[PDB]
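Task card 7
Instruction: Convert sequence to structure tokens.
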Amino acid sequence: MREWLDILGNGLLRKKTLVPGPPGSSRPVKGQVVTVHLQTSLENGTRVQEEPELVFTLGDCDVIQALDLSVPLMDVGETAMVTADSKYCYGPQGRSPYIPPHAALCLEVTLKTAVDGP
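Output:
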């Protein structure tokens, strides 16, 4: 019963909460080290990446925009779906070997923990 959010106002980077974070949960802060379960599929449903324990510093400047701009909007414990044009993913570059140039992606993200950086 949750709505899509159009993050950038152009239809090309959209997020929906699939499983809300529970009462009292909050958003991660940039500079925290987050751990996510990330599933990536081509807009057609082909699964191209799965990482159950992906650790990264939220806000690192080279994280694809589709994640940098969506993960801060999640609560810890939330699962979200992100639909993102290639413009906000790997663009004309693609991600070898399985993501071609210009691929729109569906990202399913579960934010597991968020911990202060060192």
